[PDB]
Amino acid sequence: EKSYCIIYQGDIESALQENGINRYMVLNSQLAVIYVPVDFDETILNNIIQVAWWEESEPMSSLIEITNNVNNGETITTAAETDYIYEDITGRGILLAVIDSGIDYLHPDFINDDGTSKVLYLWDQEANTNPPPEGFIFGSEFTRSQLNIAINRNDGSLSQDNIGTGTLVSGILAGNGRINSQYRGITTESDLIVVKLKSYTDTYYAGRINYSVSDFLAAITYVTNIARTENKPLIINLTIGVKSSAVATTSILDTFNILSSAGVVVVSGAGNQGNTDIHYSGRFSSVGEVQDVIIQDGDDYALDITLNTNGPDKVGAQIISPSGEVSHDIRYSPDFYIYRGKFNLENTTYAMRFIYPYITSGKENLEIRLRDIKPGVWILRLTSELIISGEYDIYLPNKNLIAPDTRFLDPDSVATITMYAASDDVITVGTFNNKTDSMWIGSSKGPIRGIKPDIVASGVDIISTYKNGTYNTGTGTGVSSSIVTGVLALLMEYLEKQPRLSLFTQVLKTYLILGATKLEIYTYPNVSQGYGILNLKNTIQQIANHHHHHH
Template sequence: MEKSYIIVYQGSLDEVINDLLKNQIEKYIILNDNILVIYVPIDFDELKLTKIDTIAWWQNSAPMSSLIDITNNMSEGENTTSAAGTDYIYKNPYINITGKGILIAIIDSGIDYLNPDFINLDGTTRIVSIWDQESTKKDPPEGLLYGSEFTRDEINQAIKENDDTLTKDNIGTGTMAAGIASGNGRLNREYKGVAVDSELIIVKLREYKDRYKKGKTNYEKTDFLAAIKYVLDIAKKEKKELIINLTVGLMPKSIIEITMLETFKDIGKSGIVVVSGAGNEGNTDIHYQGVITSLEEKNDITIQVGEQLNLDIRIVAVGPDKIGASIISPGGEVSYQIMYSPDFFVYRGKFNLEDTAYEMKFTYPWLESGYQELIIRLLDVKPGIWNVRLAPEFIIRGEYDLYLPNKNLMSENTRFLDPDSVATITLYATPENVITIGGYNGRTDSLWIGSSKGPVKNGGIKPDIIAPCVDIISTYKDKSYNTATGTGVSSSVVSGVLALMMEFIKEQTNEYEEALYTQQLKTYLMLGATKNEIYTFPNVSQGYGVLNLKDTIISISNNFE
């Protein structure tokens, strides 16, 4: 067993590595010029990190979960052609774009590489490479610690021999995302994806079990960031434009100034675009927000806890405010009251009646927001009604948010009793240089009920647009098709659309670099989006409207006339 941390380092790389080795930290990955990740034994004392001069800041890894839910509803499913409106492209004699020359990265549960929808007519793969983080069959990619990399040539040989043993997608969400964005429909033309000639970079993330509830699978932030490094490195070698489709998400956050994604210098360059599902927490009771009006005031927030193993509660304050907390067990025991301290000390205790241990850590300022983050972790938590008691130390605005983990990692019965559905955008979908896609339900012609909502406080409107995401039919494991729902579905639709847009722009002008930045592409999506006149746009549920491929292509064409 091991755990992992994200490290923001300072000084020369040689000095950093030397300091790590001095402290018996031998497993590390240099991600870029700002951050690295370390993997250490489960009993590693994290306070060591505060004493290493070349470490400017550190944080524990955090769990991530899928933004795609396999629904097994083929009888009522909608094909991707209908959802994305791609008939306008593929039946138009004056437009000849298929996503050719554009890479789409899928970082999820892997891929069924033998599915004909990922194979060209000549029998060769459309997959540039696969990094299976769990495999031990081959060496890991250069600069990385674990897993196996499979090249295009090796995948082609496996296809030729009908060998399905290189790597497997045991869950199906990665294959689903790849098929929606890029499947060519060779197995069934009715179920082809959006950009049928785009190519794929695949990362199969390592799976972790039972973090909060037995039987639930999560991924880890450190492994995910290593995957970002990998796909950027591959795109650079291939010298092609890249769309990174984020179909897994972290816990939502209400305030974000910068994320770890933005430490990768290539993200934000022309031709490198990140697309993320907004999150699936619009109706899941994992967010609470409130206001404290005086230093004498105490606020109690009630959480119903179901049958699960552990629980994390995150408390975020706005601006320079500092708000401490304690937690009250179902039996009436009160924990230590943690308040601001300039150190990284972790306070530990135990509720004797419930036999539940707790850990509490107050970070100020938290690097990714510049404000407070207070984490309460309950270990071997017991079902019942728990209360978080907030105690202000310094307030100007008094606003605060509390978050529980993503709902699909927890018991169905764990929830805030008085939740709020706004400000539930998953963390890596919050930055301005990410195109954030909410979910649309084509059956009801309305917002999908589970789609996470903005805003991002101090950061403006999110999502940017919404796109179809309910029971969309696409490729599934074992050379089959299935249906899926969630904002990872809508981000996959838009990833394919962006591949078409980028190829179309390259056809319009030889000086296309300026038009392939994230902000320009996002603007075209916003301009083309359908805006129902009964709503005011932009808004925190639908952003600038519903994806409209035809009007988006027309808006691009008008710009280059």
Template sequence: MELSYPITYIGDIATALKDNGINNYIILNQTLALIYADKKFNENILDKIKQVTWWQEARPMSSMIEINRILEGGETVTNASGTNYIYDNPYISVSGEGIMIAIIDSGIDYLHPDFINDDNTSKIISIWDQSSSKGTPPEGMIFGSEITREEINKAIKEKDSTLSRDNTGTGTIAAGIASGNGRKNALYKGVATKSELVVVKLREYEGLFEEGKINYYNTDFLAGIKYVIDVYKKEKKFLVVNLSIAEKSRAYVLTNLLDTFEELKNPGVIVVSGAGNEGNTDIHYEGVFKDKKSPHDIVIEVGLQKLLDISIASNGPDKIGAAIISPSGEMSYHATYEPENDEYYGKFILEDSPYEMRYSYPWLLSGNEELLMRIINIKPGIWTLRLFPEVLISGEYDIYLPNQNLIPENTRFLDPNSFATITLYGATESVITVGAYNDKTRSMWIGSSKGPIKGRGVKPDIVAAGVDIISTFINQGYTTSTGTGVSSSLTCGVIALLMEYIYQQGPTMRKLLFTKVLKTYLMLGATQNEIYTYPNSSQGYGVLNLQNTMKAIASKI
């Protein structure tokens, strides 16, 4: 696996990188760039390039869609989204026409009839297959192949499935929920049936933490965001970006790297993210120091895996040191904040497990401390994380393991906390964050991540159906799936309908086509159960209700 890094920069970064022998890079915008390098790359060189203001090794991401692979007992998208109110109403004529929905996931089965129009042309504007070497990369990119609508249309005519393949199926599921037209089976159509798709098939990496588990990287994901924006500029259509994959959860977030893309703040561009699938996965621990005298010991059970990442975040200006104690009783270095030393390396001799610790203070995305600890060749057993209070104001801290679907089920905190488990990209106000609701039981799906974002308010914003939803699948089939990526996909389709409806009302109403404004209308229209207080950390402002939201918008016309 090659190494990759997101970096923020000032000045002429292209010249600066080339002058330092770095030739594989992608400039995403005026602030953010990506570097790709081989395993021998000395990343410390980045500290010496004055144009580089911040850098970080690529972080793993994983899917927020769990594939059930059965149809029995599934719920149709139509019932889950309430779109009969739209499609059966003679006075409302919207279907998502003129709206692009971006799917950045595992790809798409472009031969599925539900992505083919009645004239046998594709609903897909283009695909960037990051793992393909058959064609040329999109402009400004350095890997993968761009597949145009013309090429897809030709493949449809010839029944050629070799242009790009979705080997996992989650991308095809997300696309079908948001946009599938139901040509193969009208019962299983998606939400915005005449919307169009722009698709990024992310490169897959296997076995980072555990053999057989697939992960993505945030560098490739951010490159996908850049590609989607480039297509949006060319097509000059409204855009809804669906985030159905997730980076690690975070409790303290002021911003994220999506905020560097100014185009995502434009009217007519909406970003929707799943809240995360970590609500019952034991990957989060929350603690508070009462004094500066006593360290805290946090117990982690570790299963059979290759390595483990542990992230520690403090609240506010607090500084916390840390060490790891292995099952055999060896203790690592005591990592503590020192301006001239932010990296520690060592090895547990008896376990034969090297480790590294990276200190960030302040961390770019929160302004707080972030300490990342990685144990390589980690052995199964009970490991203890020992935290040392150094500078305390609030004393609060949060610790996270990787997303559960990347690690063994028995790797977990023994005393976990299910709150503050919202994924990083769903944690800011610039994104509509959606949790997963179970329509069958009229209750939250147990795996849906919970808020809050500490010091920043309530998340998720709303919740939407996300359990056993029927959608398109690979090999021109259908399946059911569950997760907050399902809920975000459904919400993206609903937003496409709302955007078309608002656009139809004329220029004065188009001022509503901003993320924060549409988010407010979704909140106003959400269904609330009288036994709960809203907003809350599980459901946000309530359950997505398309009919009520349409009425709330209509009342302003």
């Protein structure tokens, strides 16, 4: 099953059904997702008048690395600096969304003294034992009442977290320290809304697991539906991400009107591509110039390469195999042609085509798909056709989806933000390393053209709940974003106590930036640290007491 995101106008449901597209979900007034067989002819979508835009759903991967280092780890209390509060603010009345690998809801650290679950709602997109949530076409929805019975019966079968990152995230936000009190999370009275996303294996490299944009967008619809029903503020914590990009405009998440409402806040990790060499930056100085971009491939099965030209610049492209066989030398043409072929010695096939993603507003990007790729040096030969600045960017998939040795020969760590964290409509969090008193080497960096991340937070070897009633440690920007999510829940309750219609992302981001710690002699803001390090105590003092970072 592949899937597509669709921007529609009119009666899209009738139109899809008339075209034999029977598996779909309408997610908001503009956005639908469809699920179709592998043999599906995507050109169909151009001849459905109710379709305005369409894009194949791309892989997403975790922003957390599990590091098995509890003995030298840092507690959540230390990372979030929450002794200043707890040593009447608990996160009461705030909903927190975890969209990830699920949750081990039988972990004692998610069970209250009276035996009830800290999870309010759980949608397991893979399960088939309860009906899906209303308006969705797969998985099983569970409520706290059901989880409470499951806890009483020690029934862990409703939904399992087989990876552990969702459990790690949930513990940062809300673990109660039942097994080890030192390891408790940030909030005590916030409710969790958990979605376990459908998973896929071996997309590029054997043994690696990814998620898919379409399923993620459906999860966004579900958790915001719940927030609307419960009429409570909601923080959505993005601990997974698509591939990195240099674009800084809004994403397809901007189709959700609810994400522009008061009391609905999106926090994302910045990305974990700061040192993974999955980004190439280049610049043409003239038209007709040829530049060769060197890619080393490890033992990948497949690879997707995205080229973006950041402006009106037009660039042609050709793929060259380690043995010297070449692909079509493609140029801009006003058609949807997919150029295909085979590198005979390598037995590798390619598909190259221009893509029109929603985020670039009609500007084409170049997509190159290599299948059955073999190890060695691959060359992307680029020819400029029209330039103003001449600048361009190329991205490989996130490193945790591809072979360890797959990389650009000449990488650029700048402009490695994961794409959904690029927009100013999200609070974007990078990872500080308290052990080295510096940024984590893996933390993605903002672009120079255009500031991300907004702030950073401790996120190296953080101890949290893990599967099967254990503790483990995690590192990365999904850890840091979880720290900020939990602290923001405390800040939102503090603001409400001493109007909720004013708790917009922009307001909360301003307070986080005003309270952030700036280390001596560095220049701020910068594309590594943003405006500085999260500081709960100083942010409260700012809330209590021209000061805007753009004024």
